[PDB]
Amino acid sequence: LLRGFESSLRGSRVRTQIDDKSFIPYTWQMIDVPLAAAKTSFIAGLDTRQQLA
Amino acid sequence: ATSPAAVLGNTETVTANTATLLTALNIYAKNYNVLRIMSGMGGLAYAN
DSSP: OOSOOOOOOTTSSOTHHHHSSOSHHHHOOOOOSOOOOOOHHHHTOBOSSSSOO | OOOHHHHTTOOTTOOOGGGGGOOOOOOOOOOOOOEEEETTEEEESBOO
């Protein structure tokens, strides 16, 4: 009770316990769906002027 | 421009001296294009 108590001694207050951890498991939400992608000929368009016909 | 007898009493090839204020020329064209949309994404068919 008197000399068997769990004090925080320097070394146990070390900044690595907060710094080497990420915030990512705390800030990301589960998303569970596909990301967007498309070709240039679709998003931009066909160059219609540069052609024979 | 200040004499309506001269503005309302003249021919096809002339107008009023105050006409020189129409300094801005605006040329418009209305065209066709195609908006293609697939798989939740969209964009124009023709670019030029």
